[PDB]
Amino acid sequence: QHPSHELLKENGFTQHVYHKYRRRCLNERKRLGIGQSQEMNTLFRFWSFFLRDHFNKKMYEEFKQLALEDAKEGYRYGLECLFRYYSYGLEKKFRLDIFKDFQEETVKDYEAGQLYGLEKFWAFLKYSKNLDIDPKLQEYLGKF
RNA sequence: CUUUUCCG
């Protein structure tokens, strides 16, 4: 019943419901601050799954921006969802712009003293179906 | 693969 799940059903997505639901999550985040909104978490989660089956560039962009604004504040759930999306989604259907984003954020995450991104990227290669990997990122995987 | 079930 929660829009975060209902919008994931076979034919459950409508523009009206999503926008109303997207608005509430954003408003709650603004009101209670970053890392303090239960909905926003739902929206992050809704995003990583939904985009895997229904890629929308503009939606992915908002997803990506909000996740990185959260992570730089210390609340990394949104970024984990983005990484989960990158690994799971690109596995499902490969997109070069998205994969290039994947490599970029994975490097930034590892350079930030983190392992979540690197582990998700490694997992992608393992379950993925000739790609040009970043040489600096290739070195990071070697020590993983 | 940490984040649901009606506070309109």
Author numbering: 796 to 924, 927 to 941
Show sentences the authors wrote.
We have also shown that LARP1 associates with the 5’TOP motif via a LARP1 family-specific ‘DM15 region’ located within its C-terminus. We show that the DM15 region of LARP1 specifically binds the 7-methylguanosine 5’−5’ triphosphate (m7Gppp) moiety and the invariant first cytidine of TOP mRNAs. Biochemical analyses reveal that LARP1 selectively prevents the binding of eIF4E to the m7Gppp cap to block the assembly of the eIF4F complex on TOP mRNAs.
We selected nucleotides 4–11 of the 42-nucleotide TOP sequence of RPS6 for co-crystallization experiments (5’-CCUCUUUUCCG-3’; the sequence used in co-crystallization experiments is underlined). Importantly, despite excluding the first three nucleotides of the biological RPS6 TOP sequence, the sequence chosen for crystallization fits the definition of a TOP motif: a short stretch of pyrimidines preceded by a cytidine and succeeded by a guanosine. A given protein molecule simultaneously binds nucleotides 1–5 of one RNA molecule and the 3’ guanosine (G8) of the RNA bound to the protein in the neighboring unit cell. Amino acids R840, R879, and H800 define the path of the RNA by aligning it on the surface of DM15 through ionic and hydrogen bonding interactions with the phosphate backbone. Sequence-specific recognition of G8* through its Watson-Crick face is accomplished by hydrogen bonds with E886 and S882.
